[PDB]
Each structure stands twice: as C-alpha cells, then as structure tokens.
Amino acid sequence: DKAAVERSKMIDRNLREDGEKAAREVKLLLLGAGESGKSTIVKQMKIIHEAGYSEEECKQYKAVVYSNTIQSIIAIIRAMGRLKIDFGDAARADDARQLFVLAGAAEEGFMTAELAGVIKRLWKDSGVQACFNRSREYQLNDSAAYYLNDLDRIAQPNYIPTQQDVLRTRVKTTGIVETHFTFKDLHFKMFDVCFEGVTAIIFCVALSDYDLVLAMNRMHESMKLFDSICNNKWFTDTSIILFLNKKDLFEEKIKKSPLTICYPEYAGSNTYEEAAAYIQCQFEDLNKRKDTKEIYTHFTCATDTKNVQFVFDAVTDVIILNNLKDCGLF
C-alpha cells in the first residue's frame, strides 16, 4: 500500500541512538455529543488492539447490564402513562406495579427469576410493544431491545456477560478518559472527552438521533458541534475523521420515520442509501475551507467489533499518509 511506502520515506529515526526502537506517537481525540458512541469506540480499541474482556472483566459489568435493562423497561412503562397507551392484556398492570415494587426496594441493578418473569411478560405485551415503537417520543436507552430480547439468557443464575453485552452497556462518562494502544507500530494516545498537538480527531454522530430530542433537535446540535470543531484553527493540520455511527439503528428506523423530521427540506426518498448520503453531505458541507481541509467520513456500528476494526484500519492509513511528519518519536 501507499501508506507503507509513504512511511518508509521517513529518516528521523536515523537521528536517534536507538531510532528503530523509538515509539512514534499519535494523539487522537474522540469528540461528539453525549451517547454518540465515544466510550464504545474506546472499548473496541481495547478489544481489538489489546487484551479482550477477561471472564472476570465481563463479570464486573453484570449489574450494569441489569441496571440498563431495568432502566429500559421502566422508561417504556412510564411512557405508556404519559402517552396514554393501554396494556394488551390488563393483567400486565399487576406486572407493571410489581416492576416498581422490586426496583424500589433494591440497592442496585439485580436480576431474579421473579423480576425476569415480570419484565418478560411486560416486554411481549402488545401495548408495551406499541409504546416501545414510539420511543422517539421519550428517552430510552438504545440498547433496550438488545437486552430485553435476550432477557432469558441474561436472567440465568450463572450469567456471564459476553463482550457484546459489555459493548452494549451505557456507562456515564465524567471527565477525560485516556487510553493507550499500539497499532501498525504507532503508539496511540486516545482521549475521550480542544487539545493543540492533536494528530487526528474522530467525531462521532448518532445517525439514529435524527428523530430524537423533540423538546433545535439532537442532529442539529451535533452539526453545530461539528461545525465548531471542524473549522477550529487548532485543527488545521489535524486529520478530521467523521464517524456516522449507529448505522444499524438508523437502517431500521429509516423505513419507519421520515428524515424530514430532522431536515424539513429533505426531498429524497426515505431509504437508507439516500438518507444516509444526505446526512453525510449536511455534515461535510459545514467545512468552511473546501480546498485546504478534507473530512474522512465512515459509516460505523461502534458495537460491531469487525466493522470498527475495518474502519480503524482505514483511519490509521489516513494518519500515516497525512500526519506522520508531525508525529514525534519517544
């Protein structure tokens, strides 16, 4: 590849006693609005480039899986009230009450056969399903269906979270998180959040946000943020990578909700191909120097390890081709 040839032109290692063993460093910022997939990308770097989630590491997330699951079903049940949606079978009302009894007396996320039964019956009720499909009207974890559909597995007494279970978790990130990994002989220093000596920025956008935060919308907030970042002077020589993320969730809701909810002027078809393209153009068009800065856009599913590996391999080649000269040796 051209990236291997390009890096082979460097001579700065020759200036160093032990240059062939020096570490060339890459500083990478992860930016984007809340819930766009930043921490998930961080988890994937650990999985792909460093030690996987040991059986004991996964175990640590067990009560997070329960907590996320409990939160999800509760959001849907409470929404039924505000949106005036009745249960399919009126016996579910007792189960709804029982959900609040059990959650209300517990210390933290937990699972029992009794709770599992309550949640399972609620989740396969037609009215609950009707409310679920109107999730754009309220706030619901994107991993709700993932965990609730797999409730039987999760509820087993000897449950051990799989890697996907962990990637699917929602954990609140406060402050700045710095992770380190080595790939293609590059020592990445990755920061989950404006830094100056930044080699590359990966900006995450939740595509599936286009019909969310009704009461400008989520997608427009993300655009406003990208506009600011992409055009900042501090990032002139910084490679700007755009992850249009949650493409899996987007593909599913596109055939259900029209893009016009977000962009009223959109007149294309409501298909994945045309709507994804349109969003990509909306973001890329925010670049205020279309002759000195290129944006590198990828459609990602951050919870998909193989897709993130493929995409990050491509991002790495962009960095090697464009930024290697400003990357120091240590």
Ligand SMILES: Nc1nc2c(ncn2[C@@H]2O[C@H](COP(=O)(O)OP(=O)(O)O)[C@@H](O)[C@H]2O)c(=O)[nH]1
């Ligand atoms: N289905 C799906 N879920 C995702 C994707 N990316 C992130 N998530 C989930 O979305 C939730 C929030 O993601 P997170 O990485 O914590 O966002 P952050 O606030 O930017 O750090 C988590 O439950 C993730 O598992 C994706 O591409 N597809």
